[PDB]
Curated annotation (Swiss-Prot), chains A, B:
Residues 66-108 are annotated as: Zinc ribbon. The chain holds residues 225 to 359 of 1014 of the full protein. Residues 1-135 form the PADR1 zinc-binding domain. Disulfide bonds: none annotated. Changing residue 22 to A: Decreased poly-ADP-ribosyltransferase activity upon binding to damaged DNA. Transmembrane segments: none annotated. This is Poly [ADP-ribose] polymerase 1, processed C-terminus. Changing residue 17 to L: Does not affect auto-poly-ADP-ribosylation. Promotes AIFM1-mediated apoptosis. This form, which translocates into the cytoplasm following cleavage by caspase-3 (CASP3) and caspase-7 (CASP7) in response to apoptosis, is auto-poly-ADP-ribosylated and serves as a poly-ADP-ribose carrier to induce AIFM1-mediated apoptosis. Changing residue 94 to F: Does not affect auto-poly-ADP-ribosylation. Changing residue 101 to A: Does not affect translocation into the cytosol. The gene is PARP1. Changing residue 90 to A: Does not affect auto-poly-ADP-ribosylation. Zn(2+) 3 binds at residues 71, 74, 87, 97. It comes from Homo sapiens. There is a cross-link at residue 25 (Glycyl lysine isopeptide (Lys-Gly) (interchain with G-Cter in SUMO2)).
Amino acid sequence: KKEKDKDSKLEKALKAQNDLIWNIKDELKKVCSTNDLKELLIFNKQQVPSGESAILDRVADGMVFGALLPCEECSGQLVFKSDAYYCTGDVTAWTKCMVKTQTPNRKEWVTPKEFREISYLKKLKVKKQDRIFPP
Amino acid sequence: KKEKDKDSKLEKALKAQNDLIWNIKDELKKVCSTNDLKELLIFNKQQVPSGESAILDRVADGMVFGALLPCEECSGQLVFKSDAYYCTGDVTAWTKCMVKTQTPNRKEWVTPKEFREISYLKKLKVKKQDRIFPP
Ligand SMILES: [Zn+2]
Ligand SMILES: [Zn+2]
């Protein structure tokens, strides 16, 4: 009964959350190259996936939700899937970690000063020149 | 003879310079409000003109050409006109400064750290939230 109501409230909050992620991705693409995004993952101790889209996705997620901590069981990298985060690590050379959670451990995402200023650096900072006047 | 050639070389350099100014204005409008631009003028010891367009114009000029120093004769504010910079100061309560130059004294324009990061602050920095999963 009110289960439906609760679901709808959640759906609305999820739409807002996904809108935010879309905006963060749209803004990162304006100022960061794939190289810049890899550096951001590396700095926050996240694995760098293959594929330019996956790199962008994991940076924007990190900036919205915080940096994922390594798996507490195997120290592998947790990855978002539609229904939960899943560890991708190896317990042994012959056994995969099965860790899965909707509430993974986080720490705050850190954006270093050089990246905080990256739009200014790329778009506004120029070497001083002399004014030229029309003949 | 070669006067025409020299003029054309200069015209081409001037077009490049004005293109740059246009781009700097276009980028500032994306990240700075009129308030932000007034703060930038004030920080670099420039008078704040009336009119939102004039404020934008003087910040972009400052970022391309450097901060104008006060008039060495009367300490007034130099202002760009089409043919030269002209001092707008008062020598006495009854006499205007007549200083005019195409090569006014400058110092480097400074953009404080908070403004260097202003795009990140406005567009990328969010308070951490919890991931929501679909029901
Ligand atoms: Zn694990
Ligand atoms: Zn003067």
